[PDB]
Design a protein around this motif. Structure first.
Motif, short mmCIF file in Angstrom:
data_model
loop_
_atom_site.label_atom_id
_atom_site.label_comp_id
_atom_site.label_asym_id
_atom_site.label_seq_id
_atom_site.Cartn_x
_atom_site.Cartn_y
_atom_site.Cartn_z
N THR A 1 0.83 -1.21 0.00
CA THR A 1 0.00 0.00 0.00
C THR A 1 0.86 1.26 0.00
OG1 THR A 1 -1.72 -1.16 1.26
CG2 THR A 1 -1.81 1.22 1.30
N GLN A 2 1.94 1.23 0.79
CA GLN A 2 2.96 2.26 0.74
C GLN A 2 3.39 2.57 -0.69
OE1 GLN A 2 4.19 3.41 3.91
NE2 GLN A 2 4.44 5.12 2.43
N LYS A 3 3.68 1.49 -1.43
CA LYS A 3 4.14 1.64 -2.79
C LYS A 3 3.06 2.24 -3.68
N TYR A 4 1.85 1.69 -3.60
CA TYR A 4 0.76 2.26 -4.40
C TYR A 4 0.68 3.76 -4.20
CZ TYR A 4 -3.68 2.18 -7.00
OH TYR A 4 -4.65 2.33 -7.97
N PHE A 5 0.70 4.13 -2.93
CA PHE A 5 0.62 5.55 -2.57
C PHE A 5 1.78 6.38 -3.07
CE2 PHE A 5 -2.45 5.20 1.28
CZ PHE A 5 -3.42 4.69 0.44
N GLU A 6 2.98 5.79 -3.06
CA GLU A 6 4.14 6.52 -3.53
C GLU A 6 3.99 6.81 -5.02
OE1 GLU A 6 8.03 6.04 -2.37
OE2 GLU A 6 7.59 4.43 -0.89
N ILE A 7 3.53 5.76 -5.69
CA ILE A 7 3.24 5.90 -7.11
C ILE A 7 2.17 6.95 -7.35
CG2 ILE A 7 1.45 4.30 -7.97
CD1 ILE A 7 3.77 2.94 -9.59
N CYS A 8 1.08 6.94 -6.59
CA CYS A 8 0.07 7.98 -6.77
C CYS A 8 0.67 9.37 -6.66
CB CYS A 8 -1.03 7.80 -5.72
SG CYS A 8 -2.12 6.38 -5.97
N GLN A 9 1.41 9.57 -5.58
CA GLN A 9 2.03 10.86 -5.31
C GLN A 9 2.86 11.31 -6.50
OE1 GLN A 9 1.85 13.08 -2.70
NE2 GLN A 9 3.32 14.22 -3.97
N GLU A 10 3.49 10.29 -7.09
CA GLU A 10 4.48 10.62 -8.13
C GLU A 10 3.82 10.93 -9.46
OE1 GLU A 10 8.17 8.44 -8.73
OE2 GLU A 10 8.21 8.04 -6.57
N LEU B 1 0.27 11.52 -9.74
CA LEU B 1 -0.86 12.39 -9.47
C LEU B 1 -0.53 13.67 -8.71
CD1 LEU B 1 -3.62 9.84 -8.40
CD2 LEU B 1 -2.94 10.60 -10.69
N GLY B 2 0.62 13.73 -8.07
CA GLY B 2 0.98 14.89 -7.26
C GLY B 2 0.30 14.86 -5.90
N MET B 3 -0.36 13.75 -5.60
CA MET B 3 -1.10 13.63 -4.36
C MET B 3 -1.56 12.18 -4.19
SD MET B 3 -5.06 15.02 -5.22
CE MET B 3 -4.38 16.66 -5.93
N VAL B 4 -1.99 11.87 -2.97
CA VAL B 4 -2.64 10.59 -2.71
C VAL B 4 -4.12 10.87 -2.49
CG1 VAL B 4 -2.74 8.51 -1.35
CG2 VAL B 4 -0.57 9.70 -1.63
N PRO B 5 -4.97 10.57 -3.46
CA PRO B 5 -6.40 10.88 -3.28
C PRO B 5 -6.94 10.27 -1.98
CG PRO B 5 -5.94 10.35 -5.53
CD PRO B 5 -4.69 9.99 -4.78
N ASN B 6 -7.71 11.13 -1.30
CA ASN B 6 -8.23 10.74 0.01
C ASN B 6 -9.14 9.53 0.00
OD1 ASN B 6 -6.89 12.51 1.69
ND2 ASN B 6 -8.45 14.06 1.70
N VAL B 7 -9.83 9.23 -1.10
CA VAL B 7 -10.66 8.04 -1.09
C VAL B 7 -9.83 6.79 -0.86
CG1 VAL B 7 -10.54 7.75 -3.62
CG2 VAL B 7 -12.43 6.75 -2.30
N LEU B 8 -8.62 6.83 -1.42
CA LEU B 8 -7.74 5.70 -1.20
C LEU B 8 -7.30 5.54 0.25
CD1 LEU B 8 -5.44 6.15 -4.29
CD2 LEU B 8 -7.52 4.75 -4.09
N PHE C 1 -7.41 1.21 5.25
CA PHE C 1 -7.31 0.46 6.51
C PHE C 1 -7.35 -1.04 6.29
CE2 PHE C 1 -11.59 -1.27 7.19
CZ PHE C 1 -12.28 -0.57 6.23
N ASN C 2 -7.78 -1.43 5.09
CA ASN C 2 -7.91 -2.83 4.73
C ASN C 2 -7.48 -3.04 3.30
OD1 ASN C 2 -9.22 -5.28 3.78
ND2 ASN C 2 -10.29 -5.25 5.81
N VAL C 3 -6.35 -3.71 3.09
CA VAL C 3 -5.78 -3.78 1.74
C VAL C 3 -6.73 -4.49 0.78
CG1 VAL C 3 -3.46 -4.04 2.69
CG2 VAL C 3 -4.42 -5.98 1.50
N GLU C 4 -7.54 -5.43 1.27
CA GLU C 4 -8.40 -6.19 0.36
C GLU C 4 -9.53 -5.33 -0.17
N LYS C 5 -9.98 -4.43 0.69
CA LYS C 5 -11.04 -3.50 0.32
C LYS C 5 -10.47 -2.47 -0.63
CE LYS C 5 -13.84 -4.10 4.50
NZ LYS C 5 -14.85 -4.85 3.70
#
Ligand SMILES: [Cl-]
Ligand SMILES: [Cl-]
Ligand SMILES: [Cl-]
Lengths: 191, 191, 191, 191, 191, 191
Positions: free
Chosen positions: D23-32, D34-41, D46-50
């Motif tokens: 999840t860390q990685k997904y978020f890092e990629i988003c930031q990179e 998208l310039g941000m980590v969208p809040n819906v994500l 709190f639950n990686v499967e969700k």
């Protein structure tokens, strides 16, 4: 359309020319009692069985025993009709409220927006319940019935409010769907 | 709440036990012909005159002469009840459609969303007109009536559609406002 | 139209004839688990990526961990579907409620008007929240969430109620917009 | 109230801080990207499967293959969100329309009243269909679908419109019911 | 239609070519004060009497004495406009809220769903009243007015809230019915 | 409640007694020309500038030059007020229609359900357009305007219809939100 509306409805449903003696007789009686023959009755008069069933129910609900006054039931009628924007019934029952209360302004208030009327709480919650039944009967709950009891209605009374209310939800729909026209005499009465 | 729903309604409107002879008989006949005594009748049965007025109208509209079939009137009943979200009527009249059509899915479709039913246009426009009355009878126009005529309904037929539809707009409201419970036997019938 | 509805939807979206082995296999498993292949799955089966995404979400929400029971989530589904008048989902999830509760009457109540059901407060406020989300999510406030907490739901539970509710607001729309047909087997099950 | 809104939602659904590696990685990629980590994500995180189930569906529908452009799907998103008055989605997806179209006013028009937009008929009917699903999917008919076909959409295209529209009917409800806050960066972007 | 919208409205209502000197002068003043000539004024400018009456009312309500701030009145305007989905007014008055509050996010919140804004109770009940007036003025009661007094509004203030609210219920309708277009400059301002 | 409604509104907005000379005169003139001082004027009369702005707009729209007759504008007024259920406006403007048309029933029809009136198509489409603005101005399209043109209205005429209709959308809301009482003389006039 810029043509004088057909009476008593826009349906070609003849009565027809020589009425059956019993219906003729009945209409003489109405004319005497009412000064007119209400057009809803002419509407049902093509079939005396239908007229009989209609009138039996109307009379019981509107004129039969109840601890709801006659006026109170007419007030319910007008509030239901206002919400459904039923011309026939607003005219006919509007007149009835002006007559029975001796207060033309009360009839206008109920026709237009009942919430403005300075009613006692008993009558106001009676009308609020009818209104809620008219807009969203599926949402009526035990707490709504208790509000009525909290202002002096017993369960028989609630049953009567429900039936009067339901009845005008029927008659409004029939009248509006068939373009049923109110007798011209009503408009100027009890002003 | 988490309590067994009172029958036949949540109102304390006792019948009571030694029924008047004529009501006893009506009920015996119902039981014998219907396999049950519909709960709506027990609710009106505290007063024979009210019961009389209800049944006369019910029977004329649903079972009396019409060019609408019995099934067609029950279809109307279900569509009106679906829109008003009337549990009593959806159960009882849903069962009637399943019975008269010998098609369980037809009942379910009209309970849930009549638009999905693969009806002929005659029956579909009949239902569309009932739906429109139910939602917005003040907006019914001559053009709406001409649609019915264009699928073979005459003006007596339109009158009948209008009255059956207005009637369920009354009985749904009464049922829902009083928490009227349908007989449990209905649910599993004609499945 | 008086023609047997196309299945699984009214869209020409072939699956197509030789299914990919993995989808074929999956469907064998459903048939075994369910007695049928639910038509929503056939609908998504033209593209396995789409089927995968659909099913991953359905399973997590409906069958994955939650302190909402399976039944509770099915109850939410039916109340949402009733408000949106989704035939597919009312049939499919109606069945599920009849199955999981062993109470056909509860399924009918939720399909028709959930407010009549004699539920404990916990389940009733769960459904009221879903209903309010379905009709007017923009009007949900902190006080609405506190009502849920006042009957034992924690914040994870509220999140689950919201997602199950939102999910059927998706699936109802897809099903109704595409004329998605429920498997005929559902109707007679668990009666 | 007069308190800073909690992020990412008003629910206490901790992530929490040492994120799972994936999840860390997904978020890092988003930031990179998208310039941000969208809040819906962050809300699902709190639950990686969700989170997995959400993102797979999001990405397939909005970014996966379709004959609808990416912009067209975001237009749909905005129109659905406007009708549902979803603040999160109107901010985030409004920004997307401004970005992909290079036309700030287009975003504003779809946020506020899509009908004013001078669209070609293809895109207008796509949006009208989404609007109708959003308001009243039970009323969608074959004729509605034929309208889409008459402006060059095929049935796979209709399916895609239906799924994107149902998806925002879910995510609006989740966002609104949980008081999900859009990232503040969005508001001033692509103006 | 995929043609650049006519300004200032879709009506052929010329101003016309040589403006009357007094209207020309007035517009020079607006341009100076505002950086633009708002298109609503060009709309009324075909007749100076009409422009005079429009502007006299706008100024009194929006800029004349009141214990409602200028911002507060602009907030009312946007909430009314959001409910009526008035593009012109959402753009024009949205800008005004961003300007007067120095808070672009507040403008977006009011445009999209005012309920999400973290307002003090005084401002929130002010907007709730405007909202209720906008959706259902006939249902406003004495208790609704007392809510306003309970948060510090006196009766003059309530009168002002009602008039500002009513005024945008007028201007939204005129703007939307005539396809009145907001000046392009507004969109990018105060972001 | 069961108390005489305050006049002219339920707000304590004193005029007060030694009126400013110019307002005294306006009122004297009203009394002399109208037989009364309309209560809306007494409500604004606490502030001459507000009264000035109201009357200038009222008089321009209702009495100023237009190709719409005075009667036609009052018809519009009544239809808007009926939809909004505005007691003040229904009484005052209902009376105006009865007066200007010399047809008591016309007033009643527009108060209750304008659709029943046998109007020529010009006047009917004018009212349909006002109704649509009142209910859903955001949905007005070029096609709606072309309907007016097809019955002989030009674009200045459409502008006038739009402004009269928006004006009553303001004044209904003000009247209703403040419990504004119409003069009792109205009810019995022109019957
Ligand atoms: Cl059957
Ligand atoms: Cl842009
Ligand atoms: Cl007259």
């Amino acid at each position: 359309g810029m043509t004088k509306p057909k009476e008593p409805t826009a349906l070609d449903l003849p009565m027809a020319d020589p009425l059956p003696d019993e219906t003729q007789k009945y209409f003489e009686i109405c004319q005497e009692k009412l000064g007119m023959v209400p057009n809803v009755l002419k509407a049902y008069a093509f079939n005396v069985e239908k007229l009989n069933a209609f009138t039996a129910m109307y009379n019981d609900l509107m004129l039969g025993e109840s601890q709801l006054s006659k006026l109170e039931r007419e007030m319910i009628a007008v509030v239901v009709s206002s919400i459904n924007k039923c011309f026939y019934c607003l005219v006919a029952h509007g007149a009835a409220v002006r007559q029975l209360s001796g207060d033309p302004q009360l009839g206008e208030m109920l026709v237009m927006n009942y919430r403005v009327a300075p009613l006692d709480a008993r009558q106001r919650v009676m009308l609020d319940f009818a209104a809620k039944m008219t807009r969203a009967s599926a949402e009526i709950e035990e707490a709504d019935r208790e509000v009525l009891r909290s202002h002096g209605f017993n369960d028989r009374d609630i049953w009567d409010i429900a039936n009067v209310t339901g009845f005008f939800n029927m008659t409004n729909r029939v009248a509006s769907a068939t373009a049923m026209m109110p007798n011209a005499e009503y408009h100027g009465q009890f002003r």
